[PDB]
Amino acid sequence: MAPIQEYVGTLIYVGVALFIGVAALLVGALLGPKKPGRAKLMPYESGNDPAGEVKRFPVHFYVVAMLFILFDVEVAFLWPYAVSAGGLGLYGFLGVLAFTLLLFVGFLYEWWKGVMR
Amino acid sequence: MSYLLTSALLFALGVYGVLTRRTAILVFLSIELMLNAANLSLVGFARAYGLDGQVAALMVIAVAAAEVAVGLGLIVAIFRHRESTAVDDLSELRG
Amino acid sequence: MTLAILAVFSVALTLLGFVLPPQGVKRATLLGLALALASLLLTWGKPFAFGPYAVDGVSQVFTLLALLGALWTVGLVRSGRFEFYLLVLYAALGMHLLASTRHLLLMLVALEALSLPLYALATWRRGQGLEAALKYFLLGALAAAFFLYGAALFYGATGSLVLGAPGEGPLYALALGLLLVGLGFKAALAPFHFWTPDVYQGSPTPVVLFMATSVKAAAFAALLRVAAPPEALALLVALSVVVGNLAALAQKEAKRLLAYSSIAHAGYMALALYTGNAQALGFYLLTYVLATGLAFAVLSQISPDRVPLEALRGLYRKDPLLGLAFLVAMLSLLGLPPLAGFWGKYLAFAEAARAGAWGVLVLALVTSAVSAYYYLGLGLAVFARPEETPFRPGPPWARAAVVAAGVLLLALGLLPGLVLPALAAGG
Amino acid sequence: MSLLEGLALFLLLLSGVLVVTLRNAIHAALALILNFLVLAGVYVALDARFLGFIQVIVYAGAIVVLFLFVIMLLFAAQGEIGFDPLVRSRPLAALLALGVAGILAAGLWGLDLAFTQDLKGGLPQALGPLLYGDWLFVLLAVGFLLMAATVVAVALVEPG
Amino acid sequence: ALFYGDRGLLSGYFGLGGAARSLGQGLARLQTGYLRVYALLFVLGALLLLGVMR
């Protein structure tokens, strides 16, 4: 085990940080002049409309996102190995290499094919 | 015992999800909740029968993650030239 | 060792495919499979565990079949993009692993390894072929989810993730069922059949070949290791055999006809599962794979895109050999001695009666007589007038293949007493 | 335990309700992030710490980002697009949903076990020997699965 | 009279053949093509199994 106390201590901390956050925002929010909407409906640039209509966006963003998940799964697995690594011995290392090369093959496919397409 | 009961409830909710939703992306979203209902169960019993259910869970997560990737990839690739993202209106296979 | 060739090849080819033009990857992958098949043969009947991976008698029979089916499908394809060979390879590996394990977490991972490349292989981009993909995937992810949930409740009830642990009262009873859902769906035992008519229709023919033999084999492989209750089975078989044969009268398009049929066939195999014998079920699947394999090859040679009932007519005029091949195939699936198809059935039925389970067995037999309706609906249609429909002849390669297949069918029909000795449990 | 415990499990269920109810996709997904956080807490609470942190890192940080990027790329201006002849299907959906909780409930009720067996907080210290031990094949299987996932995923989207 | 009778019987057997078609198409419209329908039938089915199982 290890102290559950210190995980609690995180929760406390989160409660403090969130509080000071919200506190600042609520001061700011409540004070200020106002003139009701009738033209603050509009956003940046050229009056209304910031730039035309864009309807669709490239696959670029999908690809980048997708990479990150699969390789994040990699990292997840490589943490246990990082910790105990004199106990797992030489056989350990071979386990690691096998796994690594497999995800690296993944990599080489997406690299030789591209991250702008 | 409480937690393990809760997991079954969370499974129930997920089923309600899959049947109700009328958007493709939100079907898939619901599936992901079900997969976590599972992973919780798996840990819950892991306290009883010790240690292997942890490693179990980790592998499970990974499978889920993999299945996310391909599935969302597909959902995108199907509807990247129309935008009525309802999960019906695939009626064209039936005979 | 069979695993050894596949895994290695899979990785190696991944990068290789950049250097070679698309044909070289077809030549390569075709070869790979053939080597993997070799490696099986020379170690026949000798078992190797390594813990997780686990070579058994069973594995050997069912992956023999699976690789066969996969060779055929890679054969015919000509289309670009190195992946449409590559993926079939992957999927095969996935099935190899699937059969060769008992340990549930591996079993899940294996299920994804085979199911993932299948979803993508469902697209030559024909509009239907995206719909198909989609249905299969969404329903698939649900059955997946059940299989994962099942495993998690199993771990509760035994204290193991190996299959073959003891068992008990309600949770273990429940748990044992929920594993049947996932595995069940992949081989399509009604009611889980639903995707099998749409997906077979929508998907392009050669791909469907791979699916209709091999995936069914592999899925069944894993199903056998489950201890499936005699009660669960009685439900499954009945619904499969009923819905299969009855519903099939209604259809008039080749792919869908064979689809509904393959719900019925899943039902018939599932009889063997009562006692469970991979001598009986082994035999069955051999006759089923060959016959379906033959039959679906012919359907590719017509068009790679859905054909109505009429198109099959006149096949004998255009080519005599093919006309006969496809004929023999159709009777073999009906079950009609002295083609092997009867023997495949007979062995299964015998295991049902041995374990004793009568009502079910009767339904099965009755509705198999029903089956003759739509099967003659194809099988004779061959001799009638040709109409205006495609029929590109296809390679000399394949012509030899198809006729080989049809000879392997009728050969075991007269001579079943060759193979049965060594498809045994210890071999 | 039932004093504090009750609240946290309540939150879990509540969060669950929201992600299958709410009629705007983003609000849904965002709720689901709150779900998996809570769940991460519940992992930590059950003598399984490492799994907790991986829950956040993978499931709530990786997976859901992928979800969100998809829901932005193509819009999702209603999370219930279609008023459709299947609008009848809402009460039948609710019916079957109840059924699946009942049957699962049965299997799980009256269960007797032990809760004694100490994982040791499931810190990565004690996970090392199993993971690269008896499960080492399974790991490599996982790894192959990922590689296949990559190859497939690319080939689906971009015609390669 | 008996002759016509024999005709009649035979058409009555065809009748049963027709019954099987009727029945047959009963299940076939159930393959509607709506995705959400298949999901519903699935869960029903999977419950049916799980009910049975004990």
Swiss-Prot record, chain A:
Catalytic activity entry: a quinone + NADH + 5 H(+)(in) = a quinol + NAD(+) + 4 H(+)(out)
Pfam families, per database record: Oxidored_q4 (PF00507)
Residue intervals passing through the bilayer: 11-31, 59-79, 88-108
Keywords, ordered alphabetically: Cell inner membrane, Cell membrane, Membrane, NAD, Quinone, Translocase, Transmembrane, Transmembrane helix, Transport
EC number(s) given by UniProt: 7.1.1.-
Biological role stated in the UniProt entry: NDH-1 shuttles electrons from NADH, via FMN and iron-sulfur (Fe-S) centers, to quinones in the respiratory chain. The immediate electron acceptor for the enzyme in this species is menaquinone. Couples the redox reaction to proton translocation (for every two electrons transferred, four hydrogen ions are translocated across the cytoplasmic membrane), and thus conserves the redox energy in a proton gradient required for the synthesis of ATP.
HAMAP family, alphabetized: NDH1_NuoA
Protein name in the entry: NADH-quinone oxidoreductase subunit 7
UniProtKB/Swiss-Prot annotation, chain B:
Keyword Transmembrane helix carried by entry: yes
PANTHER family, alphabetized: NADH DEHYDROGENASE SUBUNIT 4L-RELATED, NADH-UBIQUINONE OXIDOREDUCTASE SUBUNIT ND4L
Major place of residence: membrane
GO cellular component, one term: NADH dehydrogenase complex
Transmembrane segments: 1-21, 25-45, 59-79
InterPro entries the record matches: NADH_UbQ_OxRdtase_chain4L/K, NUOK/Mnh_C1-like
Membrane topology classification: Multi-pass membrane protein
Listed HAMAP family: NDH1_NuoK
Keyword Kinase: no
Subunit composition and interactions: NDH-1 is composed of 15 different subunits, Nqo1 to Nqo15. The complex has a L-shaped structure, with the hydrophobic arm (subunits Nqo7, Nqo8 and Nqo10 to Nqo14) embedded in the membrane and the hydrophilic peripheral arm (subunits Nqo1 to Nqo6, Nqo9 and Nqo15) protruding into the bacterial cytoplasm. The hydrophilic domain contains all the redox centers.
Gene3D superfamilies: 1.10.287.3510
GO molecular function: NADH:ubiquinone reductase (non-electrogenic) activity; quinone binding
GO biological process per UniProt: ATP synthesis coupled electron transport
Any matching Pfam family: Oxidored_q2
Recorded catalytic activity of this chain's protein: a quinone + NADH + 5 H(+)(in) = a quinol + NAD(+) + 4 H(+)(out)
Enzyme Commission number(s) from the entry: 7.1.1.-
Organism, scientific name: Thermus thermophilus (strain ATCC 27634 / DSM 579 / HB8)
Keywords annotated in UniProt: Cell inner membrane, Cell membrane, Membrane, NAD, Quinone, Translocase, Transmembrane, Transmembrane helix, Transport
Cited NCBIfam families: PRK05715.1-2
Protein name: NADH-quinone oxidoreductase subunit 11
Entry's family note: Belongs to the complex I subunit 4L family.
Subcellular location: Cell inner membrane
Swiss-Prot record, chain D:
UniProt-annotated location(s): Cell inner membrane
Recorded family membership: Belongs to the complex I subunit 6 family.
Subunit structure: NDH-1 is composed of 15 different subunits, Nqo1 to Nqo15. The complex has a L-shaped structure, with the hydrophobic arm (subunits Nqo7, Nqo8 and Nqo10 to Nqo14) embedded in the membrane and the hydrophilic peripheral arm (subunits Nqo1 to Nqo6, Nqo9 and Nqo15) protruding into the bacterial cytoplasm. The hydrophilic domain contains all the redox centers.
Catalytic activity: a quinone + NADH + 5 H(+)(in) = a quinol + NAD(+) + 4 H(+)(out)
EC identifiers of the protein: 7.1.1.-
Name of the protein this chain belongs to: NADH-quinone oxidoreductase subunit 10
Source domain of life: Bacteria
GO cellular component terms listed in the entry, alphabetical order: plasma membrane
Pfam families, per database record: Oxidored_q3
Annotated transmembrane regions: 2-22, 26-46, 56-76, 91-111, 137-157
Stated role: NDH-1 shuttles electrons from NADH, via FMN and iron-sulfur (Fe-S) centers, to quinones in the respiratory chain. The immediate electron acceptor for the enzyme in this species is menaquinone. Couples the redox reaction to proton translocation (for every two electrons transferred, four hydrogen ions are translocated across the cytoplasmic membrane), and thus conserves the redox energy in a proton gradient required for the synthesis of ATP.
Membrane topology designation: Multi-pass membrane protein
Keywords in alphabetical order: Cell inner membrane, Cell membrane, Membrane, NAD, Quinone, Translocase, Transmembrane, Transmembrane helix
GO MF, one annotated term: quinone binding
Gene behind this protein: nqo10
Swiss-Prot record, chain E:
Location within or outside the cell: Cell inner membrane
Transmembrane segments: 33-53
Family, similarity comment: Belongs to the complex I subunit 5 family.
Job description of the protein: NDH-1 shuttles electrons from NADH, via FMN and iron-sulfur (Fe-S) centers, to quinones in the respiratory chain. The immediate electron acceptor for the enzyme in this species is menaquinone. Couples the redox reaction to proton translocation (for every two electrons transferred, four hydrogen ions are translocated across the cytoplasmic membrane), and thus conserves the redox energy in a proton gradient required for the synthesis of ATP.
Subunit note: NDH-1 is composed of 15 different subunits, Nqo1 to Nqo15. The complex has a L-shaped structure, with the hydrophobic arm (subunits Nqo7, Nqo8 and Nqo10 to Nqo14) embedded in the membrane and the hydrophilic peripheral arm (subunits Nqo1 to Nqo6, Nqo9 and Nqo15) protruding into the bacterial cytoplasm. The hydrophilic domain contains all the redox centers.
Protein name listed in UniProt: NADH-quinone oxidoreductase subunit 12
Naturally occurring in which organism (per UniProt): Thermus thermophilus (strain ATCC 27634 / DSM 579 / HB8)
Full-length numbering of the shown residues: 552 to 605 of 606
